[PDB]
Amino acid sequence: NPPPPETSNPNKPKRQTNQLQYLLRVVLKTLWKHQFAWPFQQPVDAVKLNLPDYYKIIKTPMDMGTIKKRLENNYYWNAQECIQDFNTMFTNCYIYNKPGDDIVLMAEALEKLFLQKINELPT
Ligand X SMILES: COc1ccc2c(c1)C=C1c3c(ccc(OC)c3O2)C(=O)N1C
Count interface residues toward ligand X (CB under 6 A): 7
Residue by residue, DSSP assigns the chain as -PPPPPS--TTS-----HHHHHIIIIIIHHHTTSTT-GGGSS---TTTTT-TTHHHH-SS---HHHHHHHHHTT--SSHHHHHHHHHHHHHHHHHHS-TT-HHHHHHHHHHHHHHHHHSS---
Q: Is 109 in the site for ligand X (CB under 6 A)?
A: no
Candidate residues 103, 113, 118, 121; the one interacting with ligand X per rule CB under 6 A: 103
Interaction with ligand X in 9-38: which residues (CB under 6 A)? none
Candidate residues 96, 110, 111, 114; the one interacting with ligand X per rule CB under 6 A: 96
Q: Which stretch binds ligand X (CB under 6 A): 19-27, 71-79, 90-98, 112-120?
A: 90-98
Q: Is 115 in the site for ligand X (CB under 6 A)?
A: no
Interface residues toward ligand X, by CB under 6 A: 39, 44, 49, 93, 96-97, 103
